Design a protein around this ligand. Structure first.
Ligand SMILES: Nc1nc2c(ncn2[C@@H]2O[C@@H]3COP(=O)(O)O[C@H]4[C@@H](O)[C@H](n5cnc6c(=O)[nH]c(N)nc65)O[C@@H]4COP(=O)(O)O[C@H]3[C@H]2O)c(=O)[nH]1
Ligand SMILES: Nc1nc2c(ncn2[C@@H]2O[C@@H]3COP(=O)(O)O[C@H]4[C@@H](O)[C@H](n5cnc6c(=O)[nH]c(N)nc65)O[C@@H]4COP(=O)(O)O[C@H]3[C@H]2O)c(=O)[nH]1
Lengths: 119, 273
């Protein structure tokens, strides 16, 4: 029934998509422990075959940076899956998910699925 | 020689399993964050942890990721807010209620550095103002049930957590050595702080009323709408005239009829209207 391993949280922080030398400001729709949803920008030259980088600017202090790959595009939206993420960024992301899930069992279960993603 | 190679296998494990990129000069951070887990699991080395992870599994990989992605909190973060507390806010609130019981809320207290920083500040204010706080000051600290909240309750910290933001004066006055590289807050600092498992998205009704609320560097983790709800409901716990603290680079930029921004020379606080 539910094919989604990670709960997707409505979130609207200032966001950027990067690829090589190109950048687009995108409108963030949701975020999860393992991906994001954003609005397709107007000048979308994006190459789905190569990796992207996302930057979520939560506040002056906190930046969530991750390597992303385009998982799908439909109806003016772009779904991204998280690949590589630095320790600092995944720590802020885990805190965001934690605070918004509000349930330790739900968190534990999501972290378990994160680790077993490549089993 | 041998310890460095283990750290390199751990680095690889993080990258190949979770896509987590460690980076270098994080050996000391790694050891600190994994320390309690390793003690509980009887694991005596990073190399032993790595082999134990890929073979036994059974929830151990999840525990390492849980501990590894738990961010540290700083002692007396930004410094000026605790000085504003002692030399401006406490004197005002005290002078306003006759020395009645003051209550302070430390929201999302994490590993506990903030609530304990507030406790130490209160103690420092009291030593110079005997008799002002007739009923004393109660500190209520909240966060999600979990590893951080458990560590905070215990009040023990390691070398890394103590080697930043904490003066030599404060180390002696408020901490007790508990074996090599481990310190614990004295009873005097501990007993004025009460920890409660409660998330910012939960109701605040059970918390009662506060003269001061500390909600610093945490509202950034919520959407605009959810943040506004938290700020509104926080207002409901504040006594009129009470103050909200947000953190050095956060502005409220909202709710002008609930909160009045106030300049404190160094800093900004919000008075509940
Ligand atoms: N490859 C891929 N594509 C995605 C993903 N998420 C969304 N899409 C695409 O975006 C459309 C909108 O998804 P939705 O707005 O959440 O609207 C969805 C959603 O509300 C719901 N839904 C469908 N499948 C699932 C599911 O597996 N789990 C959950 N929780 N809801 C689902 O049905 C609606 C329509 O489903 P779709 O026709 O599939 O249409 C989906 C799909 O084409 C994804 O993770 N991977
Ligand atoms: N926050 C956020 N994260 C996103 C989004 N799109 C993809 N991700 C992340 O990328 C992963 C890969 O999804 P997929 O390859 O399309 O593979 C997906 C897809 O095949 C399928 N699926 C899940 N939801 C839908 C849906 O709504 N519609 C359709 N047609 N397929 C879905 O389940 C598989 C695994 O789903 P996930 O575990 O959730 O894992 C997703 C998710 O972690 C998004 O729009 N927002």
């Amino acid at each position: 029934d539910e094919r989604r391993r990670f709960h997707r949280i409505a979130f609207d922080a200032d966001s950027e998509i990067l690829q090589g030398e190109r950048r687009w400001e995108v409108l963030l729709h949701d975020v999860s422990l393992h991906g994001i949803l954003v609005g397709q920008p107007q000048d979308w030259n994006g190459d789905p075959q190569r990796p992207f980088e996302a930057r979520l600017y939560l506040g002056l202090d906190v930046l969530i940076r991750m390597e992303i790959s385009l998982a799908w595009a439909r109806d003016g939206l772009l779904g991204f899956e998280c690949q590589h993420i630095d320790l600092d960024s995944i720590s802020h992301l885990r805190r965001l998910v934690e605070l918004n899930l509000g349930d330790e069992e739900l968190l534990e279960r999501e972290l378990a699925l994160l680790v077993s993603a490549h089993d | 020689s041998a310890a460095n190679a283990d750290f390199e296998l751990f680095r690889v494990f993080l990258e190949k399993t979770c896509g987590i990129v460690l980076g270098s000069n994080k050996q000391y951070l790694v050891s600190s964050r994994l320390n309690k887990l390793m003690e509980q699991q009887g694991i005596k080395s990073l190399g032993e942890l790595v082999q134990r992870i890929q073979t036994q599994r059974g929830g151990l990989r999840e525990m390492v990721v849980d501990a590894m992605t738990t961010n540290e909190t700083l002692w007396f973060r930004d410094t000026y807010p605790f000085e504003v507390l002692k030399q401006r806010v406490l004197p005002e609130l005290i002078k306003a209620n006759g020395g009645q019981r003051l209550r302070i809320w430390s929201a999302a207290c994490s590993s506990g550095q903030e609530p304990y920083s507030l406790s130490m500040a209160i103690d420092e204010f009291e030593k110079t103002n005997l008799g002002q706080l007739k009923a004393g000051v109660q500190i209520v600290a909240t966060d999600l049930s979990g590893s951080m909240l458990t560590a905070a309750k215990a009040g023990e910290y390691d070398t890394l957590a103590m080697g930043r933001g904490l003066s030599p004066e404060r180390l002696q006055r408020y901490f007790d050595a508990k074996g090599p590289g481990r310190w614990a807050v004295k009873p005097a600092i501990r007993s004025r702080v009460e920890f409660r498992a409660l998330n910012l998205l939960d109701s605040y009704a059970s918390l009662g009323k506060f003269d001061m609320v500390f909600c610093r560097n945490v509202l950034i983790y919520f959407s605009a709408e959810v943040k506004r709800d938290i700020l509104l409901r926080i207002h409901g716990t504040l006594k009129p005239g009470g103050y909200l603290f947000l953190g050095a680079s956060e502005a409220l930029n909202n709710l002008p009829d609930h909160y009045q921004m106030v300049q404190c020379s160094p800093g900004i606080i919000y008075r509940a209207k």
